[PDB]
Amino acid sequence: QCVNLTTRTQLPPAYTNSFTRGVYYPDKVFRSSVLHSTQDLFLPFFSNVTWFHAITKRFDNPVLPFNDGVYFASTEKSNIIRGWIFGTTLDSKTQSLLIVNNATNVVIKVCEFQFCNDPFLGVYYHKNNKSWMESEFRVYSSANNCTFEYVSQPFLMDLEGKQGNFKNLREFVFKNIDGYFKIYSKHTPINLVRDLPQGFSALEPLVDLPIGINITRFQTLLALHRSYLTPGDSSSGWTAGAAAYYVGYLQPRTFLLKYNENGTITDAVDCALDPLSETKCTLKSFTVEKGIYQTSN
Amino acid sequence: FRVQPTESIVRFPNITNLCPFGEVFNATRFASVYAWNRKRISNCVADYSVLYNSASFSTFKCYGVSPTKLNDLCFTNVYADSFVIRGDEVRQIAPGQTGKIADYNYKLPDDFTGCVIAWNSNNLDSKVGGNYNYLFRLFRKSNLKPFERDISTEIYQAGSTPCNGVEGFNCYFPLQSYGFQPTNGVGYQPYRVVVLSFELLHAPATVCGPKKSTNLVKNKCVNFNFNGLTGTGVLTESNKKFLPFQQFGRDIADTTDAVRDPQTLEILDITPCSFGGVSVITPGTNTSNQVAVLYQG
Amino acid sequence: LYNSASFSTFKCYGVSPTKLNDLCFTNVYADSFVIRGDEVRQIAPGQTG
Amino acid sequence: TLVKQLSSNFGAISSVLNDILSRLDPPEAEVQIDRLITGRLQSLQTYVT
Ligand SMILES: *[C@@H]1O[C@H](CO)[C@@H](O)[C@H](O)[C@H]1NC(C)=O
Numbered sequence A: 001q002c003v004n005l006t007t008r009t010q011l012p013p014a015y016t017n018s019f020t021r022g023v024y025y026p027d028k029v030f031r032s033s034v035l036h037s038t039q040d041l042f043l044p045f046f047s048n049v050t051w052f053h054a055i056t057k058r059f060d061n062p063v064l065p066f067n068d069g070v071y072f073a074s075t076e077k078s079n080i081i082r083g084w085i086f087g088t089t090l091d092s093k094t095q096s097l098l099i100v101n102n103a104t105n106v107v108i109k110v111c112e113f114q115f116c117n118d119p120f121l122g123v124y125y126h127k128n129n130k131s132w133m134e135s136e137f138r139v140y141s142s143a144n145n146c147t148f149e150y151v152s153q154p155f156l157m158d159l160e161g162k163q164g165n166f167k168n169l170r171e172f173v174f175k176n177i178d179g180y181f182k183i184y185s186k187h188t189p190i191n192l193v194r195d196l197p198q199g200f201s202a203l204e205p206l207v208d209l210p211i212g213i214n215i216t217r218f219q220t221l222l223a224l225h226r227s228y229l230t231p232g233d234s235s236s237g238w239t240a241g242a243a244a245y246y247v248g249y250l251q252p253r254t255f256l257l258k259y260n261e262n263g264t265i266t267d268a269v270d271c272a273l274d275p276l277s278e279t280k281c282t283l284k285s286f287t288v289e290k291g292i293y294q295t296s297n
Numbered sequence B: 001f002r003v004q005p006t007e008s009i010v011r012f013p014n015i016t017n018l019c020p021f022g023e024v025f026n027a028t029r030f031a032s033v034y035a036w037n038r039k040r041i042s043n044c045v046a047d048y049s050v051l052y053n054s055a056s057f058s059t060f061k062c063y064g065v066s067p068t069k070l071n072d073l074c075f076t077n078v079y080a081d082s083f084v085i086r087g088d089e090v091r092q093i094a095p096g097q098t099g100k101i102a103d104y105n106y107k108l109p110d111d112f113t114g115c116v117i118a119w120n121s122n123n124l125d126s127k128v129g130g131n132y133n134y135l136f137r138l139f140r141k142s143n144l145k146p147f148e149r150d151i152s153t154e155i156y157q158a159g160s161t162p163c164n165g166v167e168g169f170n171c172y173f174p175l176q177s178y179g180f181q182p183t184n185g186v187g188y189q190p191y192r193v194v195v196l197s198f199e200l201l202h203a204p205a206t207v208c209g210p211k212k213s214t215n216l217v218k219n220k221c222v223n224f225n226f227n228g229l230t231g232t233g234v235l236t237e238s239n240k241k242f243l244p245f246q247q248f249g250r251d252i253a254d255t256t257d258a259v260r261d262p263q264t265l266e267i268l269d270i271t272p273c274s275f276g277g278v279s280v281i282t283p284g285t286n287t288s289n290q291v292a293v294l295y296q297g
Numbered sequence C: 001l002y003n004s005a006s007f008s009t010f011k012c013y014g015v016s017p018t019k020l021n022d023l024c025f026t027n028v029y030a031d032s033f034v035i036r037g038d039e040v041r042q043i044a045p046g047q048t049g
Numbered sequence D: 001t002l003v004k005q006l007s008s009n010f011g012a013i014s015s016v017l018n019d020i021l022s023r024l025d026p027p028e029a030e031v032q033i034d035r036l037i038t039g040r041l042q043s044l045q046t047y048v049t
C-alpha cells in the first residue's frame, strides 16, 4: 500500500528571471583560447523560468511536462530533493525511468512501475536511536518486467528537518536524443537565497545512459521530514523543510562560446537575443567597433 | 623537401570480451518484419573473419564501408536488426529504395553506413499448412520515418466508411500472414535478414578490431593509429590539461594536435614532421658546375 | 463513384482506388454484363471458371 | 578563409582524406577523392585571383 498525502496547501507557481545560466560543454573535444560557435539545444538567456516552493503544510509535486529538454536547478540545504521520475504514461503500462538517490545505493533503473497518485519519499526520525531512516518507500507499487537496471554505489547524506538558508546550488540538465539519456551536473556553493546569482558556470557531463524510451512528463521526488515531536502521519506531522527548485525548458539556439587558456568556458553570447548580440555573433568577437554592419536578410 | 616516417605504432584498447554473433545469426526464434527487434552490442572485440567467408550467406552488401577493412577501423554502438521477409523482397531493403514493405515497415536511411546480411531459410521458418506467425503491413496512412516501429492493430480506413474497429465495407486489416510453405518456390521462401548499423557518435569507442597494440615510441616521425585515427607526426609529452571526460584536442584549423593514449591514459602532443622547400643557386653553367642548396624551413 | 457506396463490389487492380481521378488515362474502355451471385469470383484477374 | 575552406565536405562522406582511404576500398574511394579535389582546386584558384 501507499499512503496518500492530505491537507496540503496549494499556491500558484511564482515566476522569476534567469540570468545567463545553463551553458554546457557540447562535445568531448578540448579547445583553448578559441571563440568557437556551436548550434544545439540551449536555454536562452533571460528566459521566463517557473519557480516552485515547498513549505501551512504547503506541498507541491506537480507533473510537469518534459518538452524537448529540462533545466532543473534546486538550491537546498537539507537535500530534501532526492530524485526524479521520467515516464510517459506513469501507470505501469509503459517504461518509466526512475532516478532516486537515498541512503542506500543510488537506484537508476527502468521498469514498469505502478506509481501511486502521490509518490513522495518519507524520512522519519526515530526515538529508539537518534538517527534518520527512510521509513516510507511507498512511491510505487510493483515492477513486473524490468528491461534494464543499473545500481550504483551507496551514498550517505545527512537528512534533517531544517528550515535554514540553502547552503549549495545544484544544477542539472536532462536531454533525450538518439536514445541516450544525458545528464550534465554542476555543484557551486551559495549562501544568498533571494534568486539565482549572476555569472557563467559551465556544466560538465556526468553520465550517459541508453534508456531508449521517449518521455513526455516528469515528476520531482520530495522527501518528508517527520521528527519525534510530530505524529508522522500523512494527515499531520509531515511538515517538510524549505524547498526551492527552478524548471526551465531548452530550445534550439545558436551560441558563441569563449574558451580560456585552461579550456573552461568563461563566457557565452546568444545569437538571437538582441541586434548587438547578433552583430557580435557575426563578427565572432565580444567587442564591436564604431561603424555599420550587415547582420542578416 | 620531406621527412619520411620510420616506424608504425597501433594503440587499441585491451578488451578480452568476444561479441556473441551466435544470437544475432543463429537464433531459434527469429523476429517478424512487422515488429523488428533491435539488439545492442558493446564492449567486446568483434571478429569479422566469419562474415566475409560467406558461409551459407546469400547476400552480403556493405554500404559506406568495405567488408575487408571492417576488422581494421574502430566503431561504437553496433546495432543488430532482425526480421523476416519474403524471398523476393530482400532487394528492396537497401538505401534509397522505396517499396511496399520498405514504406510500410522497417526502412533504411539514405545515409546508412552498415552491412546487410541475408541468407535463405528453407523450412526452419515454414510450415506445411502455411506459417502465419510472420505478418506484414500493406496499409499505412503515412510512410514510416527511418528506424520506426508500429505496434498498432487497427482496421485500415478506406473511403468514407469508418474503420479501426467499425468493421464493414472498405475496412481491411493492414496486417497479412505471409503464408510460407516449403512447397513454394525459392522466391517465396522466407529469408532471414539481419542489418548491422555502425556509428562513431563520440570520441570513446567500444567495439574495436582484433589488431594487436604495439609499444609507444616518441620524438620520431612515425605513423600513429589511436583508436582508428590515422596520422603522421612526431609524438611528444604534452603539458595541456584535459578534463576527465575529454579525450581529443583540436586547434584553430580544427586538425587534431593532441590525443590521450588509451592504455596508459597519458596526454601526448602531435606535431607534423618538417617539410620546407628546396632552392638551388648557380653561379652559371658557363662559369662553373658547382651549386649551393638552400632549405627554406 | 468511390464515395457513393452504391456498389456491392468496388475493387481496383493495378491502380489505387482512392486516387484514380489523379492519374490521366489515354483511353478508357467500359464493358457491361449482368451475372449470377456465384459468378462474381469468376470475373476477376487470375481467376478461371 | 583559405584554411577554413579545408574542412568542408564538398559532397564527400567525410572531409578527411585518411578517413575515406581507410573506410573505403580504392575503386569506391576515388569518387569521394574527386569531389574534394575539385572543391579544393576551385578554392585555390579563387584565392590566387
Ligand atoms: C513570465 O510570464 C508571465 C505570464 O505567464 C508574466 O506574468 C511574467 O511577467 C513573465 N516573467 C517576466 C520576468 O516578465
Ligand SMILES: *[C@@H]1O[C@H](CO)[C@@H](O)[C@H](O)[C@H]1NC(C)=O
Residues within 6 Å of the ligand: A112, A144, A145
Ligand atoms: C512481461 O513480459 C512477459 C514476456 O513477454 C509478458 O508475457 C507479460 O505480459 C509482460 N508483463 C506485462 C505487465 O505486460
Ligand SMILES: *[C@@H]1O[C@H](CO)[C@@H](O)[C@H](O)[C@H]1NC(C)=O
Residues within 6 Å of the ligand: A088, A094, A214, A215
Ligand atoms: C512517445 O510515446 C508515446 C507513448 O504514449 C507515443 O504515443 C508517441 O507516439 C511517442 N512519440 C514518438 C515520437 O515516438
Ligand SMILES: *[C@@H]1O[C@H](CO)[C@@H](O)[C@H](O)[C@H]1NC(C)=O
Residues within 6 Å of the ligand: A260, A261, A262
Ligand atoms: C589555469 O590553471 C592554473 C592552475 O590552477 C591557474 O594558475 C591559472 O590561473 C588557470 N588559468 C585560467 C583560469 O585562465
Ligand SMILES: *[C@@H]1O[C@H](CO)[C@@H](O)[C@H](O)[C@H]1NC(C)=O
Residues within 6 Å of the ligand: B286
Ligand atoms: C661563355 O663565356 C665565353 C666568354 O664570354 C663565351 O665565349 C661563350 O660563348 C660562353 N658560353 C656560354 C654557353 O654562355
